[PDB]
PDB file of N, CA and C in Angstrom:
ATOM      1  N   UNK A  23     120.858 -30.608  58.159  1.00 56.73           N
ATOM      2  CA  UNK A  23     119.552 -30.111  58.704  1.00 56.73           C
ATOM      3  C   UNK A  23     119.063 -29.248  57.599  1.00 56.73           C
ATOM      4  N   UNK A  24     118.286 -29.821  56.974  1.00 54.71           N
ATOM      5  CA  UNK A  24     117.709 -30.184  55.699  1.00 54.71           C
ATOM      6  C   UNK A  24     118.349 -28.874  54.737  1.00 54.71           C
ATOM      7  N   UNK A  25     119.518 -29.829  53.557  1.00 54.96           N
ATOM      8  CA  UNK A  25     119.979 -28.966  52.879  1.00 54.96           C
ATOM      9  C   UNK A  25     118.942 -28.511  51.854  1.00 54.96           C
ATOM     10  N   UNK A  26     118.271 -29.071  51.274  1.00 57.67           N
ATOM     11  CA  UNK A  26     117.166 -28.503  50.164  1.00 57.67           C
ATOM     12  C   UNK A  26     115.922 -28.775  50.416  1.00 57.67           C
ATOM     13  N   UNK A  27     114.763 -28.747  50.177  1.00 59.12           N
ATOM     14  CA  UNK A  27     113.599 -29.218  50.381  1.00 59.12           C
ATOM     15  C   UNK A  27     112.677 -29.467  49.053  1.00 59.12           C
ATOM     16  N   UNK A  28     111.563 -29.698  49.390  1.00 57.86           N
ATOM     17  CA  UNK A  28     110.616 -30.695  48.811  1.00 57.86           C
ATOM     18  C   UNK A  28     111.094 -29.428  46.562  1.00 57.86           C
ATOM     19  N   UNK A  29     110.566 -27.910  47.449  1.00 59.34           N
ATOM     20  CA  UNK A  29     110.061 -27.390  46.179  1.00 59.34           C
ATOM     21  C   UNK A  29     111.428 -27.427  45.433  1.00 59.34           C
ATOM     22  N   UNK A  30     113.003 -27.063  46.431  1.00 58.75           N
ATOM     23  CA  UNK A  30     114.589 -27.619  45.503  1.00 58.75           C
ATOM     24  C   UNK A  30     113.967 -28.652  44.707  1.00 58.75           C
ATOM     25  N   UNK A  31     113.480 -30.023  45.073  1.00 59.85           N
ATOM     26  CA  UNK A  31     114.311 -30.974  44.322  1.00 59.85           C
ATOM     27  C   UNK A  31     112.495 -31.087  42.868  1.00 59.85           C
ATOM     28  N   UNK A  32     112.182 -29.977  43.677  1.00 59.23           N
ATOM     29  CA  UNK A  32     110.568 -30.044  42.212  1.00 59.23           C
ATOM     30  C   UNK A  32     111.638 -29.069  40.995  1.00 59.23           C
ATOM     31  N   UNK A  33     112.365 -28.031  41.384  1.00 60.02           N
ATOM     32  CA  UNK A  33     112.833 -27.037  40.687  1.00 60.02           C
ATOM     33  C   UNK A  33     113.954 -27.657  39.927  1.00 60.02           C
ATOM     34  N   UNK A  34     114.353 -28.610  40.100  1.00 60.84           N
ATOM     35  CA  UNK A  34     115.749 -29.587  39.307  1.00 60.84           C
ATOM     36  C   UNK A  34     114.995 -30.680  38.413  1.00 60.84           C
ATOM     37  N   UNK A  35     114.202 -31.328  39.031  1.00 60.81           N
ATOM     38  CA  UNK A  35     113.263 -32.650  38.571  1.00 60.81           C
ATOM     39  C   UNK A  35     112.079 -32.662  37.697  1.00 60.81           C
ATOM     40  N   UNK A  36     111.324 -31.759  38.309  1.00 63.64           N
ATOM     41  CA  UNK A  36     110.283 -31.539  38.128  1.00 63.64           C
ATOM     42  C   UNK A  36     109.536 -31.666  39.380  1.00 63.64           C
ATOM     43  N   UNK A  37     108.062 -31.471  39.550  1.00 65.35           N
ATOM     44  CA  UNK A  37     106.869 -31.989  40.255  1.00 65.35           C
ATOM     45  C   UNK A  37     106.016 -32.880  39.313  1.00 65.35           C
ATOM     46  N   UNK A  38     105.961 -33.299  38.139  1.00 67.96           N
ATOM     47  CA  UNK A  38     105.702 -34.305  37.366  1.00 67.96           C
ATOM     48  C   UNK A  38     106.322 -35.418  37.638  1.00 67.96           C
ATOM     49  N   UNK A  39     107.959 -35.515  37.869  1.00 68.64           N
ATOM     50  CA  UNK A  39     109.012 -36.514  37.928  1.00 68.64           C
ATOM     51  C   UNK A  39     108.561 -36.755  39.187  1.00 68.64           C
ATOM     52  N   UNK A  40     109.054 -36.411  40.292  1.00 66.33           N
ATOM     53  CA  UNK A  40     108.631 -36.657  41.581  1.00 66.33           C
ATOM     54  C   UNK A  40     107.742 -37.144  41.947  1.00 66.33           C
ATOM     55  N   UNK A  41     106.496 -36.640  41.575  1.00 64.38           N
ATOM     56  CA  UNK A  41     105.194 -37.252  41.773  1.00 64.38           C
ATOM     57  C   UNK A  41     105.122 -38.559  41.262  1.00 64.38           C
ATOM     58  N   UNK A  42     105.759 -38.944  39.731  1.00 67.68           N
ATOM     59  CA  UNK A  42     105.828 -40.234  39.276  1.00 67.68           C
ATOM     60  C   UNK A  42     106.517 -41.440  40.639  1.00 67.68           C
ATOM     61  N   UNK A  43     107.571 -40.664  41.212  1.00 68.10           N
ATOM     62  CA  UNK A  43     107.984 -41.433  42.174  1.00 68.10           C
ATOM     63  C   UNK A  43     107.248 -41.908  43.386  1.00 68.10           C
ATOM     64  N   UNK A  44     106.511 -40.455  43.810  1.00 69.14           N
ATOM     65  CA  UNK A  44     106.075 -41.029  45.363  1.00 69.14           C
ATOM     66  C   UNK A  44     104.448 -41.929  45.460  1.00 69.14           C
ATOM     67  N   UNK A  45     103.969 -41.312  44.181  1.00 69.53           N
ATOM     68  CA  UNK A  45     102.229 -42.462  43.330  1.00 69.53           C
ATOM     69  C   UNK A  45     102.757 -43.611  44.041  1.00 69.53           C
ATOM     70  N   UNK A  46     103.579 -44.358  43.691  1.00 69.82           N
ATOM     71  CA  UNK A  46     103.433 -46.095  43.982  1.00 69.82           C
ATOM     72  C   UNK A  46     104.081 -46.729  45.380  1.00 69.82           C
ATOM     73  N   UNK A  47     104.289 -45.642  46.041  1.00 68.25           N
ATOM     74  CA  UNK A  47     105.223 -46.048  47.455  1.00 68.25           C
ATOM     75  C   UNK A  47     103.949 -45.911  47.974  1.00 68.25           C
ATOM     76  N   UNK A  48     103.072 -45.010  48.180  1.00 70.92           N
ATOM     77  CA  UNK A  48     101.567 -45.255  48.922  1.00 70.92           C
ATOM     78  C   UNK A  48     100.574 -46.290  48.653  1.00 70.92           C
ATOM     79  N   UNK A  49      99.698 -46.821  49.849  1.00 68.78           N
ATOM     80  CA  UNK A  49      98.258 -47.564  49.668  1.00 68.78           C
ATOM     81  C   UNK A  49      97.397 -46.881  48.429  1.00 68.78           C
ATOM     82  N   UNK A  50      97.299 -45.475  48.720  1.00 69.72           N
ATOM     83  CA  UNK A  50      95.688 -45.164  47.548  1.00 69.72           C
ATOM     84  C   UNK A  50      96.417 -44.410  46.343  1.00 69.72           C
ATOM     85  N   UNK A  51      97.794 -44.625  45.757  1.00 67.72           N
ATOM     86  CA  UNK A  51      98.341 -44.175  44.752  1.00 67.72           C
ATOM     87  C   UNK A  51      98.373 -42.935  44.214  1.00 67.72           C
ATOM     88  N   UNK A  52      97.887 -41.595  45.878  1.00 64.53           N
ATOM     89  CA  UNK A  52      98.377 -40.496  45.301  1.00 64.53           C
ATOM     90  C   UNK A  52      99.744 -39.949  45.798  1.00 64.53           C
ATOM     91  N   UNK A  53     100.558 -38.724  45.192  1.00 63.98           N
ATOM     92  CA  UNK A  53     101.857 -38.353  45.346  1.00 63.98           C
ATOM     93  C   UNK A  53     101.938 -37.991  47.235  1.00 63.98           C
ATOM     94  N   UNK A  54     102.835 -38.189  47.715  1.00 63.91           N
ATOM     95  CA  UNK A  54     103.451 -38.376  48.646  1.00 63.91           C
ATOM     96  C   UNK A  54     104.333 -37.519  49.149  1.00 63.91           C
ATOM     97  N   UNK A  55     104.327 -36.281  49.362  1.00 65.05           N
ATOM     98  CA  UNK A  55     105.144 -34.950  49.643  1.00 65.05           C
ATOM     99  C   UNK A  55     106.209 -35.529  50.857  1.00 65.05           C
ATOM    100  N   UNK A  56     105.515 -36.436  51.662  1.00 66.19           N
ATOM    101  CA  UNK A  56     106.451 -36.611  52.952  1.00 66.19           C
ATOM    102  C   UNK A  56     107.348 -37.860  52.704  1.00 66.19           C
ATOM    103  N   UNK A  57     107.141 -38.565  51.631  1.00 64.32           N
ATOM    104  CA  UNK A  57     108.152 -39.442  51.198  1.00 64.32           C
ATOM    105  C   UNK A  57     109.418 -38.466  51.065  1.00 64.32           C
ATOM    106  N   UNK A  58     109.024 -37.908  50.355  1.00 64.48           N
ATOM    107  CA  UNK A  58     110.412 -36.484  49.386  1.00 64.48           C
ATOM    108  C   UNK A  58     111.044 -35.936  50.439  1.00 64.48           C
ATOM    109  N   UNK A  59     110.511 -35.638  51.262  1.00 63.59           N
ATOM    110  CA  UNK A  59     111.382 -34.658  52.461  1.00 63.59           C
ATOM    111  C   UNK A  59     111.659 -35.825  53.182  1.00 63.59           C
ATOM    112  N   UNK A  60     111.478 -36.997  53.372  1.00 61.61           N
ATOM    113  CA  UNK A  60     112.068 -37.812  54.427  1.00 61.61           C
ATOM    114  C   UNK A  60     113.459 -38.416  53.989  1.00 61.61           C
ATOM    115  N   UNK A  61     113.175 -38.630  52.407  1.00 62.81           N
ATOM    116  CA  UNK A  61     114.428 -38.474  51.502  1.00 62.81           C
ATOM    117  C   UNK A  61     115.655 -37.372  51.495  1.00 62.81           C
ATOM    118  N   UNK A  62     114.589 -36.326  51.909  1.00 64.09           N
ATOM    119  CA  UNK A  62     115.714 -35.234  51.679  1.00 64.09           C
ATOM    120  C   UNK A  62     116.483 -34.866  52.974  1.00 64.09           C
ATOM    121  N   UNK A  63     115.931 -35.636  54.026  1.00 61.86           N
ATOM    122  CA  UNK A  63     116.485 -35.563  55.558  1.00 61.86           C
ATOM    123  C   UNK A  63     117.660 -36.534  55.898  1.00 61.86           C
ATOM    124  N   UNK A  64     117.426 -37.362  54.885  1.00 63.30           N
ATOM    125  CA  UNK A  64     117.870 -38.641  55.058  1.00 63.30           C
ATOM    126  C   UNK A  64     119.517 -38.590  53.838  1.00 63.30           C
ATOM    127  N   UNK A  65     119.142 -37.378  53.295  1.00 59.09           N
ATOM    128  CA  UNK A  65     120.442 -37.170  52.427  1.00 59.09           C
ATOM    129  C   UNK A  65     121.301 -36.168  53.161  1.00 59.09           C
ATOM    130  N   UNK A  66     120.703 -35.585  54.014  1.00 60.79           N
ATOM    131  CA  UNK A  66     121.239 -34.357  54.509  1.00 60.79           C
ATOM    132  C   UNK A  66     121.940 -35.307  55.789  1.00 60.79           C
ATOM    133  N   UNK A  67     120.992 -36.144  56.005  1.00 57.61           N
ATOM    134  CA  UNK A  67     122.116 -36.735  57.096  1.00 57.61           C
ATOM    135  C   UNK A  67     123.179 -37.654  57.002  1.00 57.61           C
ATOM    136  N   UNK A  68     122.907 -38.289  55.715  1.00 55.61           N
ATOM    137  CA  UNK A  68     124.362 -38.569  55.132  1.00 55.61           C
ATOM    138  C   UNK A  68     125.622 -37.583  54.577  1.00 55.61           C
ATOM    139  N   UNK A  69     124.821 -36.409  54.259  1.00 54.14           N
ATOM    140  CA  UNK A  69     126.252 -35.807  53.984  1.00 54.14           C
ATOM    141  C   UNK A  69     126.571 -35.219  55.225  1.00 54.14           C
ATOM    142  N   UNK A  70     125.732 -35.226  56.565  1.00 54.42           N
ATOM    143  CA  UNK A  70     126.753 -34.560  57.586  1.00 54.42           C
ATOM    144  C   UNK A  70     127.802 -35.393  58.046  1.00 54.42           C
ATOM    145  N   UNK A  71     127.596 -36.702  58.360  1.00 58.47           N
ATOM    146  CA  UNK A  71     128.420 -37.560  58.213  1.00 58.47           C
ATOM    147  C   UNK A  71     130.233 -37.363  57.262  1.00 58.47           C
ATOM    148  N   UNK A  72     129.909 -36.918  56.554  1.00 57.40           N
ATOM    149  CA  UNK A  72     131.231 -36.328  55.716  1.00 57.40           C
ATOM    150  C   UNK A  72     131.258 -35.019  56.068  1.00 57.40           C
ATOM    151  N   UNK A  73     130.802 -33.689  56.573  1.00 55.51           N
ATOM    152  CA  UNK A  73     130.744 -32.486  56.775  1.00 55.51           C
ATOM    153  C   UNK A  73     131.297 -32.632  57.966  1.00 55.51           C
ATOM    154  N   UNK A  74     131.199 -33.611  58.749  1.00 55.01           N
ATOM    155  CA  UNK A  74     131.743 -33.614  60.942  1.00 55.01           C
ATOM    156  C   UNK A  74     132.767 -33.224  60.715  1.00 55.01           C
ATOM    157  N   UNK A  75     133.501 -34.199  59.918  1.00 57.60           N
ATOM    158  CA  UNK A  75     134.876 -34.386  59.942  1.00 57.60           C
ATOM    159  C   UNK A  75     135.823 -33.080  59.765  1.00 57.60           C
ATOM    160  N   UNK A  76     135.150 -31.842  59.262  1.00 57.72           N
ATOM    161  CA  UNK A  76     135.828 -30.404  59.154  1.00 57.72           C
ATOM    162  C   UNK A  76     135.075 -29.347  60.213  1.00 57.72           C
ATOM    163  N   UNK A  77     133.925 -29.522  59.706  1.00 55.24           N
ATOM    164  CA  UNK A  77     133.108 -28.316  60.181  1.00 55.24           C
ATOM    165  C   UNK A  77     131.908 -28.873  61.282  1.00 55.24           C
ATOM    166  N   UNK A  78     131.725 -27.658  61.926  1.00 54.67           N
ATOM    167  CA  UNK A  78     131.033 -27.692  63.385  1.00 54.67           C
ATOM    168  C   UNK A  78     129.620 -27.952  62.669  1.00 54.67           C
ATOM    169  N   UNK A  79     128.497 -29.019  63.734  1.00 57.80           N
ATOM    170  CA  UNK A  79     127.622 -28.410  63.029  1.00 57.80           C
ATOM    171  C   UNK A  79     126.469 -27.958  63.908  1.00 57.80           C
ATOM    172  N   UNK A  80     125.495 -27.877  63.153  1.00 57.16           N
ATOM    173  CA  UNK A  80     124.857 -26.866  62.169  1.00 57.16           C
ATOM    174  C   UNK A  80     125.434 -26.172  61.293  1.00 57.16           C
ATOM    175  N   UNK A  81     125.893 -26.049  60.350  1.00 55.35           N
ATOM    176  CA  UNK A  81     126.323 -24.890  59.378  1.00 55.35           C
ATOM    177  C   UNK A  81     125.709 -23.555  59.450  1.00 55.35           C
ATOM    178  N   UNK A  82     126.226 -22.663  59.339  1.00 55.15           N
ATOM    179  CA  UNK A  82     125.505 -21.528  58.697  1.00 55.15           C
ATOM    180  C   UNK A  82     126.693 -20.915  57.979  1.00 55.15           C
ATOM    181  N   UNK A  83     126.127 -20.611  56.251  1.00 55.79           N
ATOM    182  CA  UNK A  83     125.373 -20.909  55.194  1.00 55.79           C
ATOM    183  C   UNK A  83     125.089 -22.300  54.347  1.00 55.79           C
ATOM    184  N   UNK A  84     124.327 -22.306  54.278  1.00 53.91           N
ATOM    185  CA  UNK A  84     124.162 -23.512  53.186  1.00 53.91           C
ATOM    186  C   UNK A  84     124.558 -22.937  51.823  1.00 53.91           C
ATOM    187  N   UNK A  85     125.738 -23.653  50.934  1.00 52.35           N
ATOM    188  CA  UNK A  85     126.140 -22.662  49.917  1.00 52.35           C
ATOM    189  C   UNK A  85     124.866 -23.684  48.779  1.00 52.35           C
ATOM    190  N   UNK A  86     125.017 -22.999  47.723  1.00 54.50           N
ATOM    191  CA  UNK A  86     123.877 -23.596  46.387  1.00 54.50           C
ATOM    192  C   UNK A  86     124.769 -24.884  46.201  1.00 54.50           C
ATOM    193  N   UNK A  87     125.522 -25.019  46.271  1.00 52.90           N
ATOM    194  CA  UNK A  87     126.594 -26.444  46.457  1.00 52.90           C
ATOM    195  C   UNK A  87     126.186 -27.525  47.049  1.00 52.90           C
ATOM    196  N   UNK A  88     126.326 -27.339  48.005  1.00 52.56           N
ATOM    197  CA  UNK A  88     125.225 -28.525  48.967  1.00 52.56           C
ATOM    198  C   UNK A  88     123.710 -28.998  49.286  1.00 52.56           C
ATOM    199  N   UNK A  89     122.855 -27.791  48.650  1.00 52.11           N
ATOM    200  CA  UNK A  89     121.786 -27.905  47.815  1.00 52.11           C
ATOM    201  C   UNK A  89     121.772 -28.729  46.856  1.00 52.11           C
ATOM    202  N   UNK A  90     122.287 -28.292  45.805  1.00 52.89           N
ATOM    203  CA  UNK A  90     122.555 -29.699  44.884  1.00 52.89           C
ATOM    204  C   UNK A  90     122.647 -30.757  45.136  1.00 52.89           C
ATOM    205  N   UNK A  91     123.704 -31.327  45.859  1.00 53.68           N
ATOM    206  CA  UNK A  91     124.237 -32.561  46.311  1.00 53.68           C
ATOM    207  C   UNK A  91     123.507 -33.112  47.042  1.00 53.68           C
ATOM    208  N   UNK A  92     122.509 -32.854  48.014  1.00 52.56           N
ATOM    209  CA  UNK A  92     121.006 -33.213  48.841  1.00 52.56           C
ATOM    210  C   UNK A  92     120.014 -33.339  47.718  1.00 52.56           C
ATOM    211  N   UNK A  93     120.118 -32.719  46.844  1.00 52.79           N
ATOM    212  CA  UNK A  93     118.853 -33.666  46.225  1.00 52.79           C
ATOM    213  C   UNK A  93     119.410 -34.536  44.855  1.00 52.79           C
ATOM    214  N   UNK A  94     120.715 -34.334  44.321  1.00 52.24           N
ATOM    215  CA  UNK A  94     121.119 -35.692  43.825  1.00 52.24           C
ATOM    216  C   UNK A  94     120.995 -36.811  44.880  1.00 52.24           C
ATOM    217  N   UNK A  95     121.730 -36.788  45.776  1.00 53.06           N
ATOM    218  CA  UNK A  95     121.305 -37.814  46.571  1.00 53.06           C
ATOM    219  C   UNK A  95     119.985 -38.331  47.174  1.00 53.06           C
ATOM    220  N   UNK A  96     119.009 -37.577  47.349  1.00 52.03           N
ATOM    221  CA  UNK A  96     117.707 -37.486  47.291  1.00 52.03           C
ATOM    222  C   UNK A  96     116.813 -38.140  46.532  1.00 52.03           C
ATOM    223  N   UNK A  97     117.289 -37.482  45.402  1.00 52.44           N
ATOM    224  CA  UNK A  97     116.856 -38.603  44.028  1.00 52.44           C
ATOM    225  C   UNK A  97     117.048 -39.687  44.006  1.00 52.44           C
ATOM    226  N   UNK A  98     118.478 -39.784  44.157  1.00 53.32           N
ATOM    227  CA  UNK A  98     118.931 -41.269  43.741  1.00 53.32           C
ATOM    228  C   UNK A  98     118.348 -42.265  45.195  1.00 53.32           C
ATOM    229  N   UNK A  99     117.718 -41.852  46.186  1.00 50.49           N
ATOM    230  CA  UNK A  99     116.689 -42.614  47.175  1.00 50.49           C
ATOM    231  C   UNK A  99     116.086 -42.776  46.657  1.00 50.49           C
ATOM    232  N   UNK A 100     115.370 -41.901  46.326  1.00 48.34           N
ATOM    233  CA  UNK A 100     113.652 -41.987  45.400  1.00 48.34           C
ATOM    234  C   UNK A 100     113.424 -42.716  44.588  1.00 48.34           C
ATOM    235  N   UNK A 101     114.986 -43.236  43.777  1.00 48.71           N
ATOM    236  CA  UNK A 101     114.550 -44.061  42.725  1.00 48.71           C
ATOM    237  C   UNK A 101     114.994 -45.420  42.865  1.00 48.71           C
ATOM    238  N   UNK A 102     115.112 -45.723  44.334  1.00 49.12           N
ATOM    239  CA  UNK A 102     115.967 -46.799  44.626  1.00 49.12           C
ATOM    240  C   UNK A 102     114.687 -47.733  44.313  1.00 49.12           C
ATOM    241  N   UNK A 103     113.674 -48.093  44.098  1.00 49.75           N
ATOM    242  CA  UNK A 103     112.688 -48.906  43.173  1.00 49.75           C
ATOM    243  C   UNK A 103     112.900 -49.065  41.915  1.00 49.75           C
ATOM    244  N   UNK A 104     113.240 -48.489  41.212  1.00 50.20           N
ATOM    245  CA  UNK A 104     113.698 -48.553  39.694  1.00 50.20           C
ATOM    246  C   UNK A 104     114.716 -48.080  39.293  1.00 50.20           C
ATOM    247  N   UNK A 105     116.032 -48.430  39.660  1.00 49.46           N
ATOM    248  CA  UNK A 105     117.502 -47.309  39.660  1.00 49.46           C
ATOM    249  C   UNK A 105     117.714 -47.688  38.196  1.00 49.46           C
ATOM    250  N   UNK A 106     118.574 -46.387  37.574  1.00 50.27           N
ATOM    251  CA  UNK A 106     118.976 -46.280  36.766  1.00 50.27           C
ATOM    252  C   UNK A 106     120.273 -46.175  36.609  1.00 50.27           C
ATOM    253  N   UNK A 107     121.466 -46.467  35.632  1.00 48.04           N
ATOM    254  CA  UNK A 107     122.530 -46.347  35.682  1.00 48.04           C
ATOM    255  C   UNK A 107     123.380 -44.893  35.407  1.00 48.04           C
ATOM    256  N   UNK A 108     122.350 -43.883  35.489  1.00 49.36           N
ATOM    257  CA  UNK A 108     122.467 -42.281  34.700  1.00 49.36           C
ATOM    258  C   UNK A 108     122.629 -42.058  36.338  1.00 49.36           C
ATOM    259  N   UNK A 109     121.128 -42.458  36.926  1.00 48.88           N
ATOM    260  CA  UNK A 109     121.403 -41.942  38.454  1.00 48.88           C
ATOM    261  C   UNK A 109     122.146 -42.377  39.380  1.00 48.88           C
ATOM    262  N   UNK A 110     122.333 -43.970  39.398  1.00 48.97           N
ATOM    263  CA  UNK A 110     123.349 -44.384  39.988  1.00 48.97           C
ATOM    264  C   UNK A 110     125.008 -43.340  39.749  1.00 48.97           C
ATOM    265  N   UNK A 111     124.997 -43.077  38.756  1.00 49.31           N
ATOM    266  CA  UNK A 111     126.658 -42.629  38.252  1.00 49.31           C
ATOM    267  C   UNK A 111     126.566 -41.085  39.076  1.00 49.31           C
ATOM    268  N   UNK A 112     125.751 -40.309  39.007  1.00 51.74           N
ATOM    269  CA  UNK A 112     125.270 -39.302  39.786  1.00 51.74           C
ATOM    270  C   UNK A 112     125.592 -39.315  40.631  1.00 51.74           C
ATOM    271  N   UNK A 113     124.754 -40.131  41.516  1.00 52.79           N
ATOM    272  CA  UNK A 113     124.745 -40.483  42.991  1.00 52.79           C
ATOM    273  C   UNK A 113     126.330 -40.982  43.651  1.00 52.79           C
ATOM    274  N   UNK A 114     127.268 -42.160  42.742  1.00 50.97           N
ATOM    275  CA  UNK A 114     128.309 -42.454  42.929  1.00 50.97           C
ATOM    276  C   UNK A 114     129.525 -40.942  42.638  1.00 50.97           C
ATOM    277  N   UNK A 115     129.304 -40.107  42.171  1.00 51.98           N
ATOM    278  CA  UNK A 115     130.089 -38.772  41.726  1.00 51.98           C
ATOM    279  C   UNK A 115     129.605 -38.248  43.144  1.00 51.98           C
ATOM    280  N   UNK A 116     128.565 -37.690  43.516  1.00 50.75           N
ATOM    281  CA  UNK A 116     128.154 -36.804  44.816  1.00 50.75           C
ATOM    282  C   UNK A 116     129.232 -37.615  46.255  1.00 50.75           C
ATOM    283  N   UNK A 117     129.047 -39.186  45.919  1.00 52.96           N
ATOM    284  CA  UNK A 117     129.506 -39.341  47.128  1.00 52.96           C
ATOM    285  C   UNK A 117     131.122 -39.337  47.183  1.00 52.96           C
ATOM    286  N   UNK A 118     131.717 -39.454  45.622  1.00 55.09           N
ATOM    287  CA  UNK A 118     132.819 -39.394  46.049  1.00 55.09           C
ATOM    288  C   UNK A 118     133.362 -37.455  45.946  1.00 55.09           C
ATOM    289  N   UNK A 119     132.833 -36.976  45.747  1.00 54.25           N
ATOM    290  CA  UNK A 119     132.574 -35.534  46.162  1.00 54.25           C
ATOM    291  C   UNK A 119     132.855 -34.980  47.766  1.00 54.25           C
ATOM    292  N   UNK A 120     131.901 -35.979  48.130  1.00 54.11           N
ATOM    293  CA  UNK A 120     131.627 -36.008  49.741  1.00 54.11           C
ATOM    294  C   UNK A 120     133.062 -35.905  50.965  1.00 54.11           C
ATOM    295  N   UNK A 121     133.478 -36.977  50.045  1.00 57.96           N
ATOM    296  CA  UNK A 121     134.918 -38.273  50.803  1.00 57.96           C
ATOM    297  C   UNK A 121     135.883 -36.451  50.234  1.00 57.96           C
ATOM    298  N   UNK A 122     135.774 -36.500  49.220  1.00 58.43           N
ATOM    299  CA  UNK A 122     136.713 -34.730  48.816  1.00 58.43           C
ATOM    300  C   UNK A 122     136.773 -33.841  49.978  1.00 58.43           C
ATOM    301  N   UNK A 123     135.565 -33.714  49.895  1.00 59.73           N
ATOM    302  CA  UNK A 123     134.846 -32.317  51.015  1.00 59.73           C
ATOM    303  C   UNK A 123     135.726 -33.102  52.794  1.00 59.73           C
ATOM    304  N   UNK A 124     135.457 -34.227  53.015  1.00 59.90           N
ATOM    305  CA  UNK A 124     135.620 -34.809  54.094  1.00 59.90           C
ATOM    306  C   UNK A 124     137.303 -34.618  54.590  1.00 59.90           C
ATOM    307  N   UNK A 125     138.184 -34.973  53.581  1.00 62.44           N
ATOM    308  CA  UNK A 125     139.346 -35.271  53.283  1.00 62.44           C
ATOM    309  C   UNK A 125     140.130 -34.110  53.023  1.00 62.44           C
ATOM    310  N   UNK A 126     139.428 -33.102  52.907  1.00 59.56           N
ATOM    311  CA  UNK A 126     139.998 -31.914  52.469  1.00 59.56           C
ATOM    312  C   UNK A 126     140.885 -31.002  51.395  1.00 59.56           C
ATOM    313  N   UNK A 127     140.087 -31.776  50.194  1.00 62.17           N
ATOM    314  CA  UNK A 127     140.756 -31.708  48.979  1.00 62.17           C
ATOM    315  C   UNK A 127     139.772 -30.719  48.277  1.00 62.17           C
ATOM    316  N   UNK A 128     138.550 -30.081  48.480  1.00 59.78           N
ATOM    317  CA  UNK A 128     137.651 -29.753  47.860  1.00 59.78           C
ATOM    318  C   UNK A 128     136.589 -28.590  48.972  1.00 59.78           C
ATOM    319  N   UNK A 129     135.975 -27.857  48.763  1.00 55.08           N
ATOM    320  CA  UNK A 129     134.931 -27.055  49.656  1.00 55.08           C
ATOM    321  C   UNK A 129     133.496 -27.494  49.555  1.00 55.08           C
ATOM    322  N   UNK A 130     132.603 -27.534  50.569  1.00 54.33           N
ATOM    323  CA  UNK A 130     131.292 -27.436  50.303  1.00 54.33           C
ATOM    324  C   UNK A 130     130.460 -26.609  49.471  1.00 54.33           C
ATOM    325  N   UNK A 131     131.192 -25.326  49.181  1.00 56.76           N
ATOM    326  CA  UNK A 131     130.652 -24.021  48.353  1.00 56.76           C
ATOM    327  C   UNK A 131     131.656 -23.424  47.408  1.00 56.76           C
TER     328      UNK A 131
END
């Protein structure tokens, strides 16, 4: 329940980068703010999926840890139109991160 939001993943990326992304997912080709957060809901609910398995949820705190990891994964949605093998490898590290956190070899923070 939304680990980072729209301005997190502008502050890692950019709002130049981002915007390049959400231009061509719309009809009239301007940037798309609610693409990004639906992304970023949609990462957060994959990593609770690995978070059940220890901890109650809702969390309270969100450490800067899992911030991160919501908008790598975030990203690597965003760019699922043109993936790259930099972000793919990213995205494949976060999740096996995840299976860590899940498994109990590793912390969220």
């Amino acid at each position: 329940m939304n680990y980072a939001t729209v301005n997190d993943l502008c502050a890692r990326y950019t709002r130049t980068r981002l915007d390049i992304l959400t231009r061509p997912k719309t009809a009239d080709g301007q940037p798309d703010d609610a693409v990004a957060e639906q992304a970023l809901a949609d990462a957060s609910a994959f990593i609770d999926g690995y978070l059940a398995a220890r901890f109650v949820l809702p969390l309270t705190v969100v450490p800067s840890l899992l911030k991160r990891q919501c908008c790598v994964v975030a990203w690597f949605y965003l760019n699922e139109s043109q993936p790259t093998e930099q972000i793919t490898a990213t995205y494949r590290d976060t999740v096996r991160w995840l299976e860590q956190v899940r498994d109990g070899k590793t912390d969220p923070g």
